[PDB]
Structure 1
Amino acid sequence: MLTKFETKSARVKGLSFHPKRPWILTSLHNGVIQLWDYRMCTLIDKFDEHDGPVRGIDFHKQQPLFVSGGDDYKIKVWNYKLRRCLFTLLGHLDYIRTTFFHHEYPWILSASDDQTIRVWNWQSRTCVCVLTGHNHYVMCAQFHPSEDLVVSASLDQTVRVWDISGLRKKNLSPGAVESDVRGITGVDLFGTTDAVVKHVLEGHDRGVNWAAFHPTMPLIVSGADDRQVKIWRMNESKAWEVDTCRGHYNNVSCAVFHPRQELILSNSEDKSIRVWDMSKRTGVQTFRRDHDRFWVLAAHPNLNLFAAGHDGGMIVFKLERERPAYAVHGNMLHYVKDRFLRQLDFNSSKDVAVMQLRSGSKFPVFNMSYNPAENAVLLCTRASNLENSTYDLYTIPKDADSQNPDAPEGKRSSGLTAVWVARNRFAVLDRMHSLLIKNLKNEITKKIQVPNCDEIFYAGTGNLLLRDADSITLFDVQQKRTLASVKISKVKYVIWSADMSHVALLAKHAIVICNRKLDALCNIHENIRVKSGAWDESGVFIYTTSNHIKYAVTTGDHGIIRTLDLPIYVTRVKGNNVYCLDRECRPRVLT
């Protein structure tokens, strides 16, 4: 788990990510709604008009609106630009558990302990439909992301799928005559014909707390007080249980599909978040807290960001490191995308898959080192336990067929980091923090014991940069001597100029630019996390934060070039063009 942001507050019952802004709404048990910027780690605003716990919260996808639903039986619709409640929807008779906006229609879906699901038109401020049929508290109701379907979860031990296609036809038909249906009082005790139960999913032994649709497949995930997460498949005529994920030891509060991977995330009152493989139904990862129960899970629609609400606040996290593994040499970019090593020529813009990587690494490639002389690549993979870290040595085939890239047999071995030192030799940092020099056959040619070395970086032919806790040392591998040292804590990336005259040392919040002797020329402190950088042909270091493209000159002058909507990894800068990789490993050019 890569924690990005963490809040301390009263119990978080609801979470919603803003689709475009780096914002998250948190609804608290004390009636307060908090709006946070998770990039800046700041509270933007607070909304406190609800009389008691707020459980339902959702951002509108396009409008400057959010909806909240509380134990006060009120649904409030808010304009976050105006920082005011626009109106309150009244009609539920008991606690509102969930509130969601429809993705196309001006509808709000609400689920309540009154055993009803209500659809509201937020433009007309009217209840348009009441879904009746659950015999207990309706803990969750969600719209299908593309179809006129609703899924609901209830303490009646059932998950129900509702067809709302009738509701759409009635409200969108332009020829609906002025019939004075002053029908205030006709709560037709017989369920309104506009929404029909399509499927009833029975199989939980206790109350169901959450249900969610799969974003693209006809799958439903449900979490219940039976401590099970169930996967359901539906078609037009039938729905059935596919399988059950077992391993929670208390009530499952929320379960969601991963929006981009075949993974299920569930959280539970057992103080754990579990990640499940959707195909194998096995627990891939488990995250625990010592004292705080989990209540709600949210996934960001467009980013690999998750949020979990617990008794003591909220966590915003990532499952995986989205940083692409890449190496730049001259006009060629080598980068890893999925299972393929790709080669991009910056001049021709030709992006070709050069080879297929060996299947079976559970962990993404952490770093890559390219050797242009032997056309060989070192791919470093870090395990969750650093001692189990591996590197793969591949030779890139010359005749790469772009449609069917060859799968060369890579030599896998144990090591923390592997970096090229010479044309026919590479250095490996072993699990024992010892420096192993290997040949192209992966044979140990020299063993060098280095005190306090956590990481190694390339520093020219025969030289390495060794990172300790508080310094970087330039080390000659042949002479086994330290040449120079610079004080900088926890350097993550080292970027040399094209002529090797200058080096940029990238820490989490600091950039130190040094000359070839490791004399510090400038030190830049950033409040925002530094992501990547590249040297321009002019000798300017262009770097990226999470929010900006910035420049730094060797004299210490630095500034903002451009705001970034998404964090990007700079690969090369040429004139007015910044070549970069996005978090999806797509090459982009920014002017």
Structure 2
Amino acid sequence: MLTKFETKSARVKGLSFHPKRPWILTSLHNGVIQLWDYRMCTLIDKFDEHDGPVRGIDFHKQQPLFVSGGDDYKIKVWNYKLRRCLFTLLGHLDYIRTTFFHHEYPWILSASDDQTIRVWNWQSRTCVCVLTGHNHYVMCAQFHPSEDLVVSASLDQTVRVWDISGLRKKNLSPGAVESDVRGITGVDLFGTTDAVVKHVLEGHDRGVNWAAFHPTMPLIVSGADDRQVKIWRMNESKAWEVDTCRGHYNNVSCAVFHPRQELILSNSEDKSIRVWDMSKRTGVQTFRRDHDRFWVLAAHPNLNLFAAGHDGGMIVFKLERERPAYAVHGNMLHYVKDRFLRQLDFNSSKDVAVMQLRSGSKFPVFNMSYNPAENAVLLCTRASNLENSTYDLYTIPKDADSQNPDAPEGKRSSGLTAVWVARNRFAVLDRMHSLLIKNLKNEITKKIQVPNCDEIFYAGTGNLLLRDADSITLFDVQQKRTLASVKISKVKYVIWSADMSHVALLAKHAIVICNRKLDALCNIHENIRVKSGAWDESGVFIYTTSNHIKYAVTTGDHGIIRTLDLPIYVTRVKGNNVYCLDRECRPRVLTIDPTEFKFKLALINRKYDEVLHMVRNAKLVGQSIIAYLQK
């Protein structure tokens, strides 16, 4: 959706994205190591680790620290946060590619680009492990599935996979049947970097730029020093696996797996990033945007962001389905991600994306609408523009890939989008790649109606009709004469107080509160182009207010119920078991505590008992007497 910030500079060999933070820590072979905790578009520190080049970047594994490597040959761990050096050893005859931190007796592993990597005890001083099996110049060193099992990629044209021990390398085994590492149709070669038949895999492909692992798995996704970046699965080991990854023009420095995405991202040198599948695999497309020279690609293990690294420089782009679809079922919120997965009600520790049988932020959505029941939803998938998509409508009791056409809380059919329209029971369905009207008394509805064909606006987006009408326009099932349009506007959604009758309105930036239909009760505006505020039902105004979560207003009252928890936005109100959202994370299930309602009523009847009883007692937070306690 947006590439938040972008200047091309840096000639980048090594890279990492913060699995915890939206940092990028970047290694240039300018000799530079940089941590920028990328969030606030600001570098925390920048040390050009030595005069010579810098190849390596790896995680310590903790929260915010770098373990770093230069042509110094030195393993440094320095905490940005603590701006200090943790324990120190230099390095052999080449730089350090991967590191891991362990702790029987706060104990340490260091992975290196030369010769050996040594694993050291500073407590009850003994040897956990010795790794020989590297030579010089490691492009991409890796922890395996078993984290402390590993792979390395070399400019010595080998790959090393090692076995470790608590008293140096060894494994005991005797049950298997054939091997995929090497044992049936196809398979790729051993290299030489070490000397024990674990597997030294052949890193010859003019040398290997990157190696990347498959967690439980031994598939590797690779950057290679050949146009050929050749993919091999050692969880298969295909033939036409002797695949050379092809640009149009030269190279494929890297091509990578994204933890989450069952895909390959390739990047190259004709000025390009090239786009690849890996779910059913195939070169999708090539994308060109300069830099005829790169060596890294990355997708966050935080998965926050995604980015591609190059010689001439770098780019980070940010994703969103700015604003994205919903359904309500008792004391529960449904979301469809702008970015981010579920978060479809209730919470438990830090942030929880709601994973349920009512998969919300997940599918390939054109549109999502509750089909009210505490037991039903209607859903369009395959999203997008087509002739038409599929909608598979699902039961809250148990959703499915497509639920039963037999069942009418499961039905699927074909159709592109389904959309509400005003004077509430007519609907739009698109079941042609254009204007079908959908109209039903029921809102378990899936109805098809070409009459009301009326283009003069060709298939696009609106929801009480607004192909940017800038009005919500009311109709029946055919007509060639407007009933009427009212000039008011939407988020491109109209908010109903649960089902399909909310005179509480969304607007994209701003949202307006109405009672049902246009009665502009009050009109909301804020100016942060991000969050939410919530209604319980028709116009119950909850507003989020910092680490404080607030009722904007009730009866004649205003109140702080309970207090927020870093950013949250009120989305809306699912029952008493309260639900809150920052956008799609930074979330709540919540024991309530209203303030105000009770209050202007209470107040109105002079009544205090409650407040008192709560023993609730502010008046200042900046102030807080100023609702009317000032007045």
Q: If the TM-score is normalised by the length of the shorter chain, which range does it land in?
A: 0.5 to 0.7
Change (3 A) 1:310 1:360: same
1:560-581 CA-to-partner distances (Å, cap 9, x unmatched) read: 9899899999775246533369
1:180-217 CA-to-partner distances (Å, cap 9, x unmatched) read: 99999999999999995610223753211111221233
Distance in 2 separating the partners of 1:182 and 1:205: 19
Moved more, 349-358 or 361-370: 349-358
Per-residue deviation, 1:142: 1.1
Change (3 A) 1:539 1:286: same
SS of aligned partner of 1:228: coil
SS of aligned partner of 1:532: coil
Distance in 1 separating the partners of 2:178 and 2:463: 84
Per-residue deviation, 1:145: 4.0
CA contact (8 A) 2:13 2:29 kept: yes
Change (3 A) 1:331 1:66: closer
Distance in 1 separating the partners of 2:189 and 2:451: 79
Change (3 A) 1:327 1:351: farther
Distance in 2 separating the partners of 1:22 and 1:395: 36
1:234-273 CA-to-partner distances (Å, cap 9, x unmatched) read: 5899999797765575433344433235334443345544
Q: TM-score, normalised by structure 1?
A: 0.66
Per-residue deviation, 1:114: 5.0
Distance in 2 separating the partners of 1:197 and 1:15: 30
Q: TM-score, normalised by structure 2?
A: 0.63
Change (3 A) 1:432 1:551: farther
1:331-374 CA-to-partner distances (Å, cap 9, x unmatched) read: 67778999999999999999999999999999712421233499
Per-residue deviation, 1:161: 0.7
Change (3 A) 1:170 1:123: farther
Change (3 A) 1:319 1:502: closer
1:501-532 CA-to-partner distances (Å, cap 9, x unmatched) read: 86555566654445545466666666655355
Distance in 2 separating the partners of 1:549 and 1:316: 33
Change (3 A) 1:52 1:466: farther
CA contact (8 A) 2:119 2:128 kept: yes
Distance in 2 separating the partners of 1:386 and 1:182: 44
Per-residue deviation, 1:151: 0.2
Per-residue deviation, 1:76: 2.8
1:456-489 CA-to-partner distances (Å, cap 9, x unmatched) read: 9999999914152977767788877889989999
1:276-321 CA-to-partner distances (Å, cap 9, x unmatched) read: 4446342456554344654323343354643332345544457886
Describe how 1:74-89 pairs up with structure 2 within 5 A.
74-86=74-86, 89=89
RMSD over aligned Cα atoms: 9.7
Change (3 A) 1:36 1:440: farther
CA contact (8 A) 1:33 1:46 kept: yes
Per-residue deviation, 1:149: 1.6
Change (3 A) 1:318 1:399: closer
Change (3 A) 1:354 1:264: closer
Distance in 1 separating the partners of 2:125 and 2:295: 30
SS of aligned partner of 2:186: coil
Moved more, 1-10 or 199-208: 1-10
Change (3 A) 1:151 1:368: same
Change (3 A) 1:186 1:135: farther
Change (3 A) 1:330 1:94: closer
CA contact (8 A) 1:342 1:351 kept: no
Distance in 1 separating the partners of 2:275 and 2:19: 23
Per-residue deviation, 1:69: 1.7
Moved more, 492-501 or 18-27: 492-501
CA contact (8 A) 1:388 1:414 kept: yes
1:36-95 CA-to-partner distances (Å, cap 9, x unmatched) read: 455555555545554455432234332552212234434332122233445654223345
Change (3 A) 1:509 1:520: same
Change (3 A) 1:582 1:191: same
SS of aligned partner of 1:297: strand
Distance in 2 separating the partners of 1:185 and 1:350: 47
Number of positions where the alignment pairs a residue of Structure 1 with one of Structure 2: 589
SS of aligned partner of 2:585: coil
Per-residue deviation, 1:327: 1.2
Change (3 A) 1:229 1:292: closer
Moved more, 430-439 or 68-77: 430-439
Change (3 A) 1:398 1:388: closer
Distance in 2 separating the partners of 1:186 and 1:406: 46
1:154-191 CA-to-partner distances (Å, cap 9, x unmatched) read: 13333221112255689999999999999999999999
Per-residue deviation, 1:558: 10
Moved more, 237-246 or 426-435: 237-246
CA contact (8 A) 1:166 1:194 kept: no
Change (3 A) 1:411 1:279: same
Change (3 A) 1:540 1:335: closer
SS of aligned partner of 1:312: coil
Change (3 A) 1:58 1:368: same
Change (3 A) 1:469 1:12: farther
Gaps in structure 1 of 5+ consecutive residues: none
Moved more, 297-306 or 1-10: 1-10
SS of aligned partner of 1:39: helix
Q: Aligned residue for 2:557?
A: 557
SS of aligned partner of 1:355: coil
CA contact (8 A) 1:498 1:535 kept: no
CA contact (8 A) 1:98 1:139 kept: no
Moved more, 466-475 or 239-248: 239-248
Change (3 A) 1:575 1:50: farther
Per-residue deviation, 1:153: 0.8
Q: Aligned residue for 1:2?
A: 2
SS of aligned partner of 2:405: coil
SS of aligned partner of 1:565: coil
SS of aligned partner of 2:270: coil
SS of aligned partner of 2:466: strand
Change (3 A) 1:573 1:579: same
Distance in 2 separating the partners of 1:466 and 1:214: 47
Per-residue deviation, 1:437: 1.0
1:539-562 CA-to-partner distances (Å, cap 9, x unmatched) read: 434478999977655999999989
Q: Aligned residue for 2:568?
A: 568
Change (3 A) 1:535 1:155: same
Change (3 A) 1:190 1:341: closer
Matched, 1:143 2:143: yes
Q: Which has the larger radius of gyration?
A: 2
Change (3 A) 1:434 1:284: closer
Q: Aligned residue for 1:50?
A: 50
Change (3 A) 1:24 1:31: same
Higher strand residue share: 1
Per-residue deviation, 1:419: 1.6
CA contact (8 A) 1:56 1:96 kept: yes
